[PDB]
Design a protein around this ligand. Structure first.
Ligand code: FAD
Ligand code: FAD
Ligand code: FAD
Ligand code: TPP
Ligand code: TPP
Ligand code: TPP
Ligand code: MG
Ligand code: MG
Ligand code: MG
Ligand code: MG
Ligand code: MG
Lengths: 592, 592, 592
């Protein structure tokens, strides 16, 4: 039972579910790596940037309900390269576990090489950030970390391990180690009865299903509750997938950018928002006064201080989403056995009528290619079990408003922080979490470049997925936002590549870069070549077992639909009211 | 005089010396970019990672004495991508100015999209980190920022600008704006007299010249003081260059890794260390007890709290290095006019005797190439005005112990934090600071990959320099440190590149990657091909005006000399006692 | 259901158990006071110092198991006067709820009158410190606060309320409000079985019962477990009372100051410490190496990061003390039904032998009075249900080593922080928590003076108790500690009072001060007058219903027993081995 602190840490991590770790080793964290090798049972992926390792951990977590991605680094700048991910994870209410090396305790206040107060730096963007001050506390801090990462509003933790703390001997009985119970508040029968009593008197209600539903692993129950009450569902961007897109009750998405015309119109026509596992995000609502006008609000959240933060709800209930939905289904079934649930045939109908006339054109034959044609071809090329990974840009905004998803955790997106560079490592993290997952990523050229070297991780370790790269040689979104300032300034990436005429002054040759990094890559200039390229990509993945990049050369400037209010979203590109122009809407097409 | 806050900020920046800015735009920082374009006078370089923009700013600062590099970003994750650089700059006592966008004040505590408390996160690693709460304070916070960045111990500042603060109208008269006076403490005649009185009774004194000398722009005065007293000089890694390497009094460098055998032996033989503008860094001293044994210590620093932090000096004086050296020269000249400065012929002589027998072998004809042969060829190929840029690894340790530098700020190195990825952007920052500078960077393969995409910045904007890439398909330094743990684990980068046989399973094809990013690249397998490659590189730079990468394929495993104490440094590779094996030592060779 | 945020706060506070509040009003907190008056159901006590209000809350909490003392103040310096109490409460793992007023949100960063960042200041010494940013969050922050104050390791919370947030209208249904579930970890059968299996093979075991037992409301179960196993009990200072002092298994207290000679000897003779609800406090253990020598350690704590913080235990279990003791009793009962619990007659016997021979003399007839005679008279004068309140000094050290307590929460003492001035307000808070409690406080002259004005609270509101004041005109404890530095410097309070000869140059006339503040007071010069004085005090309380101070004039210098190690405690005053000298030891005297 006598043992190094880091050796005890391996028992804890194992009993606590960890089988994978992403990281970059260093002298200050070598004892940890030594204990991991001696113990076995954890697969280590070596990243080619610490930020990459961080975002891989995020993807690993977000892929499957019980998963906790682990990120490993040395002292000093390794810890400062993980702050963006801790922020991203905090912001979206999901956990990662960061572990950093550190100089010995005696030397923390002498300016020891690569010694920084990572504890103070990480505090504002984690549920806990702590420097472990005793060897015997190493297993206990991890014990406490897993409690915090699963309980209440989930979030990330950073553990900082001084060299001398790691290597010191402790007494530890791993047979005696017990994971702590997970804390979750639960709604009462009375509260839920009031909520359903309120729902039934609404003439035109909608359910807004947030990422909390997914966090609680409660997608089936949400769908069941909507079905029993016959109430249309609007998923948030983070709730996207918790009811399938081809379901009769899914009424679209709402907001300023990643939303549908029918979604916004249905919300503006509704007389109630039944919010479950959502907060009321800035870009979902616009001006709160407008979002709430003539409309009752119910809000169910696991976190007390998220209720009333942005708007004051008519009801507001503190509860885990699974517990609350279990009651909601039970209470709905009792209302149904009495004659107390109203028929909602008409309201459901005209929600669907909006859904098949208020569309956006995707079927463009133009050369150079219009980006909205790319998302049409993706819907056709990939099956219903597809899992999309993306970050930020005109690339992901248009993707969000034109792609379709049919299960929970088949849209992996850092919705609140959106750090460029996220997409590649996040994708790799999902693949490591589930080798059966049909992972497909979307990026613009700038996002693709930030952490482009992480493709070589996918090559070294054989982690295959498909990366769709839509290239306009622009910071697209920013160029569009600069219209209000009457300029086009510091947003172009184009230049004449002295080694590559083929790219026609678009600058970076992503095909050569991808191939040099050990991957496969295909470039597409014409819209009809997109479908064949995706089939080529699937074949290359199967034999070579590496990431395959499909680059599409876009027209330089395309303005994607968006606005500052729900009733104010601007359509720059062609709208559509029939299937010929928008053939991959779920109402017009059966998904594999 | 009525004007936007950001428009007033441009006047301040201009009057305060700024002509260059590195950044990545976004919606939250667009008003700033708008004011910059309207005003003119600042050259913007678009980076391809915010971290890249940050490290470019660091290089820009470090290149020339009055320079302040500026780093521009949006809200949220842009700010969290700059923390590593703020740390790096703080750690080495040098300033950068970071400016980030931010959500409006009314919405800072609602979870507004990409809104983070960057103020709290950046606090521990900057002299000031502040969110500007009023429009009229925008010019005043910048005014205060430049005072802090130049005064006392220099360090970096972060300014966080809420959207509504940027665009609000203020009254501002730019003709009335006055930069604040720079605060610097100065030594007294009495203190310096005591220091020189102490120096003259020392039998075997050495001067340890730190990065403070360079910070104060006092290299000429340091050399003059050493010459007048006839006292050998040991530069710290950060002081390297403040006396030329071929000077008769430069006795080498001291420490655990980036040091010379003769340097360590001279220090261990000395009876006094006269520390000017140094702190006594962990990897310079080893165990303080050993560094100080039988030896008197004088310590001159600008910062009171740096004196006595690691060891207690016999004297210790608070002063700017230029002011102190001006007195030291004056007092030395008075001692010389009397008969009071001792002759030090013998001590100087046997310092030089060590310097020409305690060497390390560089002239290896092996294939695959030994890294120490690369540094030999660099010394031959490049002129005396060469400016080296590097970060961390066996690549930079061996570079530090075998390359030679002949002027101050011709060794640009992040000595305390050493964040991987630093080298490329830092190099580009130096080039932007001085288009006449003969900039040459050294990286290992892992460092090169972290922020590899920033090469495309060098291509888009035409910023030429030479990047020497020493490739062993390894995390070299870490592999070496793992010897003590009896392992070789998670430190290899090698794989069979399915697109490139030429690289022989070394993994990433840096030539293809570099060319795809718009640059030129040459690969070298044999030692005799290195000299021609460097001449080819100089030609390519002149016509194409882009970064040129010279990749050298190294043998996989080479153990570089290092240890945990000055008397304990281990020589794994062949030592040398004559010029045939080490032909580029300054005593054996005249530098252009 | 439309209502001010402060009105909703009253519903929350009431449903959450609050019936009492201590405070000092101000303009910034007037809306709260207004809502409190309108709602009814909370008794407000006006303090005469905010610090007084804070410590009253602490006493109120500590008095009875479910109690949460509430402290109310204005903005600015009211909040900074509560930091000492937040620290004290945190330090001893007990909650108080502080509520402060604050300037409007729009003006928090303009230097608005009495506006301070209390959130930042209070963060390091509370489980939560928050400025409420929205009206609708007021009830939710309080909801979250009560969860934190009851769950895990209990601690204090500070809620900071901007004026405009208090007065704003919100929608709130109080019938729908549900207090959150309390989180507590619980031990498993397996873990407890291992602990009992370990205890059984110990030859000379001791149970150390800490303040966690009292916190968990598990005194009866602890006694029962000790009885079933026949294992002697050592309470910590904070665990004191959880087994009665006259119990046959209570073996005394251990430590450097508030300890018994028999307690220390028993512990040094033991071969195991079974720690339940204790941490291993600095002044309980001395050097950890000496405390653990030849001894096994079991440690049961509710907080993971308290286990291994000071020493590494042989077992260590994370659990609430009530849940753990329920299992321990169950498992003990099963061991007893088998023949598996050993007989411990001999070990119990010689623990009791120590307890009746290793004593300290208390029966002194000296004039001026020796302080140890005071505690003897207190034991005689007061019943078994007596409840002592004290803080720090030779006054409380000697009290702790000579008084006796017979139930849990009949020793109210701020053991980790010990802030001077605590005693008076703490006592008043206990009395407000329970008007049937026979409260008796002990102070030295300096402790008594810090917050002497709070006696007038006891007079204005009719809150009676007895305050024993032992007066030596000295900072006694500090004088004693200064012996090692060979001095007596800045520790005397004596002067010739120009209004009072009767005090003989002892300085402050506490009788005149107490009477002026509206209370009654008696002064005693001779030991035989102490008993009658206590009887007089009881009579005055009954009739006048106010605090009654009994001042005893001590000899100026008395050195109380203490040391830096358990085997190193020094006896300056006479020891004793018989009842004649120490007549109030529980084995010589029946209590009530
Ligand atoms: C360029 C860009 C444009 C965007 N445009 C839009 C847009 O138009 N419309 C839009 O909606 N979004 C958009 N987004 C995303 C948006 O910013 C938010 O990330 C998203 O709306 C928030 O989702 P949510 O409300 O479900 O909250 P989440 O971040 O998913 O979290 C909501 C709540 O879940 C709670 N919770 C956690 N666990 C549980 C549990 N187990 N049980 C119950 N509750 C739990 C948390 O307390 C939290 O308050 C955009 C993002 C970007 C990158
Ligand atoms: C892998 C690796 C190995 C290394 N090995 C070694 C090694 O073997 N030996 C070695 O020496 N270094 C080594 N270094 C670098 C080392 O860690 C430190 O960065 C370096 O020694 C510190 O330099 P310095 O003492 O001059 O202090 P600096 O960081 O340069 O600063 C010293 C002082 O200058 C003062 N100062 C600032 N401005 C002024 C002013 N105007 N006037 C006067 N004073 C001022 C500051 O207050 C500060 O205390 C290594 C680095 C790495 C990456
Ligand atoms: C002048 C002076 C001298 C002193 N001398 C001594 C001395 O001689 N000897 C001595 O022992 N003390 C002495 N004290 C007090 C001492 O400093 C500590 O306050 C005391 O030792 C702590 O007791 P404890 O171990 O029970 O810790 P506590 O402060 O009571 O807390 C212990 C543990 O309880 C846990 N806990 C909280 N709730 C629960 C729960 N529901 N279930 C399970 N665990 C829970 C916490 O996590 C914590 O780790 C002295 C104080 C002063 C003022
Ligand atoms: C670290 C960071 N810096 C800046 C931004 C602002 N960001 C938003 S989208 C965007 C442009 C991305 O362009 P690209 O990835 O090429 O996709 P496009 O919009 O052109 O489709 C930028 C710069 C960000 N989200 N993160
Ligand atoms: C962000 C970060 N992570 C990890 C480290 C530890 N780091 C020290 S040198 C090194 C290996 C670098 O190898 P390479 O750049 O290929 O050069 P080599 O040592 O092989 O010459 C590592 C991983 C660091 N300095 N910074
Ligand atoms: C705010 C504060 N300041 C200083 C101390 C140190 N304190 C320890 S006991 C003590 C002396 C108290 O003397 P008194 O209350 O007269 O009791 P005596 O020691 O004479 O019995 C002091 C000054 C403290 N606990 N708190
Ligand atoms: Mg990169
Ligand atoms: Mg683009
Ligand atoms: Mg390498
Ligand atoms: Mg007072
Ligand atoms: Mg006293």
């Amino acid at each position: 039972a006598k043992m190094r602190a880091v050796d005890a840490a391996m028992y804890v991590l194992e009993k606590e579910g960890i089988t994978t770790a992403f990281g970059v080793p260093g002298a200050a964290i070598n004892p940890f790596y030594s204990a991991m090798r001696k113990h076995g049972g954890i697969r280590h992926i070596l990243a080619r940037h610490v930020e990459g390792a961080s975002h891989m951990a995020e993807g690993y977590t977000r892929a499957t309900a019980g998963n906790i991605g682990v990120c490993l680094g040395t002292s000093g700048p390794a810890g400062t390269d993980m702050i963006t991910a801790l922020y991203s994870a905090s912001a979206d209410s999901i956990p990662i576990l960061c572990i950093t090396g550190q100089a010995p305790r005696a030397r923390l206040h002498k300016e020891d090489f690569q010694a920084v107060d990572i504890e103070a730096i990480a505090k504002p963007v984690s549920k806990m950030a702590v420097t472990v001050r005793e060897a015997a506390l190493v297993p206990r801090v991890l014990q406490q970390a897993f409690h915090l990462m699963r309980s209440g509003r989930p979030g990330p933790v950073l553990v900082d391990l001084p060299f001398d703390v790691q290597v010191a001997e402790i007494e530890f009985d791993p047979d005696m180690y017990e994971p702590l119970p997970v804390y979750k508040p639960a709604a009462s029968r009375m509260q839920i009865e009031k909520a359903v009593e309120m729902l039934i008197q609404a003439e035109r209600p909608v359910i807004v299903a947030g990422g909390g539903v997914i966090n609680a692993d409660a997608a089936a129950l949400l769908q069941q509750f909507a079905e029993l009450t016959s109430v249309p569902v609007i998923p948030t961007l983070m709730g996207w997938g918790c009811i399938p897109d081809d379901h009769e009750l899914m009424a679209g998405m709402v907001g300023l950018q990643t939303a549908h015309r029918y979604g916004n119109a249905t919300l503006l026509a509704s007389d109630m928002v039944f919010g479950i596992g959502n907060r009321f995000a800035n870009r979902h609502t616009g001006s709160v006064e407008k979002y709430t006008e003539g409309r009752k609000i119910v809000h169910i959240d696991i976190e007390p201080t998220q209720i009333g933060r942005v708007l004051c709800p008519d009801l507001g209930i503190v509860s885990d989403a699974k517990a609350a939905l279990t009651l909601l289904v039970e209470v709905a079934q009792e209302m149904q056995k009495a004659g107390r649930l109203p028929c909602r045939k008409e309201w459901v109908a005209d929600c669907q009528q909006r859904k098949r006339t208020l569309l956006r054109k995707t079927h463009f034959d133009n050369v150079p290619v219009k980006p909205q044609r790319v998302y049409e071809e993706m819907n056709k090329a990939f099956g219903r079990d597809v899992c999309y990974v993306t970050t930020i840009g005109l690339s992901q905004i248009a993707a969000a408003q034109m792609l379709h998803v049919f299960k929970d955790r088949h849209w992996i997106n850092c919705g609140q922080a959106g750090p460029l560079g996220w997409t590649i490592p996040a994708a790799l993290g999902v693949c490591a979490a589930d080798p059966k997952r049909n992972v497909v990523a979307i990026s613009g050229d700038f996002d693709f470049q930030f952490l482009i070297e992480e493709l070589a991780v996918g090559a070294q370790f054989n982690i295959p997925y498909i990366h769709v790269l839509v290239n306009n040689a622009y910071l697209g979104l920013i160029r569009q936002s600069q219209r209000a300032f009457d300029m086009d300034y510091c947003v172009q990436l184009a230049f004449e590549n002295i080694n590559s005429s083929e790219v026609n002054g678009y600058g970076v040759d992503h095909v050569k870069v991808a191939e040099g990094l050990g991957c496969k890559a295909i470039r597409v200039f014409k819209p009809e070549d997109i479908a064949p390229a995706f089939e080529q990509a699937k074949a290359l993945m199967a034999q070579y077992r590496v990431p395959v990049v499909v680059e599409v050369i876009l027209e330089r400037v395309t303005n994607i639909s968006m606005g500052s209010e729900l009733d104010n979203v601007m359509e720059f590109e062609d709208i559509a009211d029939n299937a010929a122009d928008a053939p991959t809407e779920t109402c017009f097409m059966h998904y594999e």
